[PDB]
Amino acid sequence: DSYLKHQEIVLDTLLPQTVSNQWRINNDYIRQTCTIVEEMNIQQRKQINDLEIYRKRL
Amino acid sequence: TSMKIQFKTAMPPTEVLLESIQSKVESIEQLQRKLQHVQPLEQQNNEMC
């Protein structure tokens, strides 16, 4: 029974190692998405300026 | 005569064991059941990793 508790503890440590790494892959992705948000939002704001300006000039 | 002597000696050695072993069989088998859930959580985490 003491042998089984040592084996069972090794599985739980592998669960934390995978959990720590999958959070890290998500954490790197979250910073990229926020930066891709502002680049798309600035692109949309510049586009809405150009559509309004071209009608105003004509 | 042997089935009288040995099996009554067997039932005494079993029930004296089963008062002690079936408590620690449940300590063994329920900890075996923790392994089959720690393995199933390991595969879906390694798949998501």
Curated annotation (Swiss-Prot), chain A:
Its main location: nucleus. One of its GO terms (cellular component) is U2-type catalytic step 1 spliceosome. Keywords: mRNA processing, mRNA splicing, Nucleus, Spliceosome. The keyword Transmembrane helix does not apply. One of its GO terms (biological process) is mRNA splicing, via spliceosome. Belongs to the NTC complex (or PRP19-associated complex), composed of at least CEF1, CLF1, ISY1, NTC20, SNT309, SYF1, SYF2, and PRP19. Present with 721 molecules/cell in log phase SD medium. This is Pre-mRNA-splicing factor SNT309. It comes from Saccharomyces cerevisiae (strain ATCC 204508 / S288c) (Baker's yeast).
Swiss-Prot record, chain B:
It is found in: Cytoplasm; Nucleus. Coiled coil: none annotated. It comes from the Eukaryota. Signal peptide: none annotated. Belongs to the NTC complex (or PRP19-associated complex), composed of at least CEF1, CLF1, ISY1, NTC20, SNT309, SYF1, SYF2, and PRP19. Present with 784 molecules/cell in log phase SD medium. Belongs to the CEF1 family. Involved in pre-mRNA splicing and cell cycle control. Required for the binding of the NTC complex (or PRP19-associated complex) components to the spliceosome to mediate conformational rearrangement or to stabilize the structure of the spliceosome after U4 snRNA dissociation, which leads to spliceosome maturation. Its absence leads to an arrest of the cell cycle, possibly due to the inefficient splicing of TUB1. This is Pre-mRNA-splicing factor CEF1.
